[PDB]
Amino acid sequence: AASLAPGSSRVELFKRKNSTVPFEESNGTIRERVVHSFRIPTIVNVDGVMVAIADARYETSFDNSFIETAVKYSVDDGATWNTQIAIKNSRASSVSRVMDATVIVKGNKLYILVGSFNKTRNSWTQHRDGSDWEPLLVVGEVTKSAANGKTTATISWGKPVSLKPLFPAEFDGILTKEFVGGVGAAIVASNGNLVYPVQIADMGGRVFTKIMYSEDDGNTWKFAEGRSKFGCSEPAVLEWEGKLIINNRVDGNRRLVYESSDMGKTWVEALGTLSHVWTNSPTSNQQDCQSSFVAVTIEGKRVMLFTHPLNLKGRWMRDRLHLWMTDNQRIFDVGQISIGDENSGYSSVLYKDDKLYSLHEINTNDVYSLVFVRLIGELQLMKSVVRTWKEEDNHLASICTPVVPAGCGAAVPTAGLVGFLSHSANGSVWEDVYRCVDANVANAERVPNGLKFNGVGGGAVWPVARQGQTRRYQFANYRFTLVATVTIDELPKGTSPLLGAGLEGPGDAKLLGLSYDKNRQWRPLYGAAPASPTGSWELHKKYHVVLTMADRQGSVYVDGQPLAGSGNTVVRGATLPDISHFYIGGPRSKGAPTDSRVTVTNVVLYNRRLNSSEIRTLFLSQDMIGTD
Numbered sequence: 001a002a003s004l005a006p007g008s009s010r011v012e013l014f015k016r017k018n019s020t021v022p023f024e025e026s027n028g029t030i031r032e033r034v035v036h037s038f039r040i041p042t043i044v045n046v047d048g049v050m051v052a053i054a055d056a057r058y059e060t061s062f063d064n065s066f067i068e069t070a071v072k073y074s075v076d077d078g079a080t081w082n083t084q085i086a087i088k089n090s091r092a093s094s095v096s097r098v099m100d101a102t103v104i105v106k107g108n109k110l111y112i113l114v115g116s117f118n119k120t121r122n123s124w125t126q127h128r129d130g131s132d133w134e135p136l137l138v139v140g141e142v143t144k145s146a147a148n149g150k151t152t153a154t155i156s157w158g159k160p161v162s163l164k165p166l167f168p169a170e171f172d173g174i175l176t177k178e179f180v181g182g183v184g185a186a187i188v189a190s191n192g193n194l195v196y197p198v199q200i201a202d203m204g205g206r207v208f209t210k211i212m213y214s215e216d217d218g219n220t221w222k223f224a225e226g227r228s229k230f231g232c233s234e235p236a237v238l239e240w241e242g243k244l245i246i247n248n249r250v251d252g253n254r255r256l257v258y259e260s261s262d263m264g265k266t267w268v269e270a271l272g273t274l275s276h277v278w279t280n281s282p283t284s285n286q287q288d289c290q291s292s293f294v295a296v297t298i299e300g301k302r303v304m305l306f307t308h309p310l311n312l313k314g315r316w317m318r319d320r321l322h323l324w325m326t327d328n329q330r331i332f333d334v335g336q337i338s339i340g341d342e343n344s345g346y347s348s349v350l351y352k353d354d355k356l357y358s359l360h361e362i363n364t365n366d367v368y369s370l371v372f373v374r375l376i377g378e379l380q381l382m383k384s385v386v387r388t389w390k391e392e393d394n395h396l397a398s399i400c401t402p403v404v405p406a407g408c409g410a411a412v413p414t415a416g417l418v419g420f421l422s423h424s425a426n427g428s429v430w431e432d433v434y435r436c437v438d439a440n441v442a443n444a445e446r447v448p449n450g451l452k453f454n455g456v457g458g459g460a461v462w463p464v465a466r467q468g469q470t471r472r473y474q475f476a477n478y479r480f481t482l483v484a485t486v487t488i489d490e491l492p493k494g495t496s497p498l499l500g501a502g503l504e505g506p507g508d509a510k511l512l513g514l515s516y517d518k519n520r521q522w523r524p525l526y527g528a529a530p531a532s533p534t535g536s537w538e539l540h541k542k543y544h545v546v547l548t549m550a551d552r553q554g555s556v557y558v559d560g561q562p563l564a565g566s567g568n569t570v571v572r573g574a575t576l577p578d579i580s581h582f583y584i585g586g587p588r589s590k591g592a593p594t595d596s597r598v599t600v601t602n603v604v605l606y607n608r609r610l611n612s613s614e615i616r617t618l619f620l621s622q623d624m625i626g627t628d
């Protein structure tokens, strides 16, 4: 949906120039005080109690002003609320402030890390030194009580402790200046470790991200050895199948993501999954924004939730806030969660007692409020999509395949299965069985498990780069596997396209693919190398086709065996290829009036290089996988 889903609603929880907070004067007296703006939100669940954390910007929305950390907690899922001032600032001057809260929840305790400043009027990365800054850690404890029927709760906040004395003066050569958390909800690793994603500023004004953790519930803190590239900020982390996943903000470029199997010791870019998928705007050269990255279990399946504005207006406007769901294989757009073309910003998401909630910013004239939202309709959609992934995966994993001369043979591979095109298809659309990325069609006629092509441009386009702003099939450039069952219906005049991957840019170059000619021979394409024909085929016969691409290599299989040339390098340079799209048949909106008279059924796409036996399994069972 392009707007807050029907059946969903929200309230202006933190209302600008209206809501008051229990401010404490120097002498101890407490007076309710108006607040210009409320920014940088985070909502979490502590032992059944909702806790909303945010910046209370008293006089103005600017970063350099009087700020304190406000809090609003609840025990009745948002019916009633209580308000406190979690952390005070130093009171050293008109601009003293504490900001950018990062939060971790373990047991009934809250661990809050923030940046504290005294007098500076310029931004942190641009300070002369670090004399004005301090990294503060605050611990909060939640206690539940109860009168007759009605439950109540209190929250006690301890005295702030500084981590400065633990900040090394240098990292592998690099001279340090300041550091803060990455903002947002953090985690408690399965081994019990408290894991903080942090952003570091060096002396020379550069920025990068790193991991800061504790094995002893807050006593000590260690800094992992690994790190990101320069330019990464406001990072968010979660735990997935044994590894840590780090999702960074990147002003003026696409978002970088890394993996780590050793609590941060070594980092590898996630080129085969999520890296470079999300960005800051259509052109990717605008200011970026914060994002939430949280792991949850829906209908018995562990998945990942990601948020981020589209920013169609550019700069700091941050409009049209979306929500994504991924299983580290497929990536689904749950729609827009903000209203119309309003201005949003930072955000937060929480799954509690089978209900979905959100806390985010709304901006008008640079005065900020914080809305509390109920994702009634979004969760519905989400629950449906998971049931599909679950159902299809198991189905494919239950088929009894032939036994190979050495009950059943090897199972049909589902690990790394990203997309599937089969029987279902309507209008100019070929439907994605996994409900994420459909393929555009032209000049086709439906057949069991696929389509038959006839006419100028007959074919299908599976969008890669052509997806636009968000590039969900970015993994293809690093590695991929394409599968398909085919038949050739009519003899071509010379050479004709059947299936492959094409590149952005001049001419109509291909990365890898397969073509057929007038002599009944296959014509494989391996990068820019001339396509010399080989082998032999017959009209109307069903053939298994497979395309492999890994380690910059390429291979093409027919009937389970490789064709001559298979194993050759397909791209020179350290620069990644830029796949425009996958092509099935011979689609085209311009140029040569291609008319590939072929029929294609059951196209499968994986995010990894399938092994030899896995290809055998597919070749011997292609008659059992179709969706009828």
Ligand SMILES: CC(=O)N[C@H]1[C@H]([C@H](O)[C@H](O)CO)O[C@@](O)(C(=O)O)C[C@@H]1O
Pocket: 063, 099, 100, 115, 123, 124, 125, 233
């Ligand atoms: C400490 C601090 O000022 N953080 C602020 C960041 C910093 O500019 C980046 O960290 C620069 O690296 O940007 C903001 O202005 C923003 O984009 O909304 C808000 C946030 O409060």
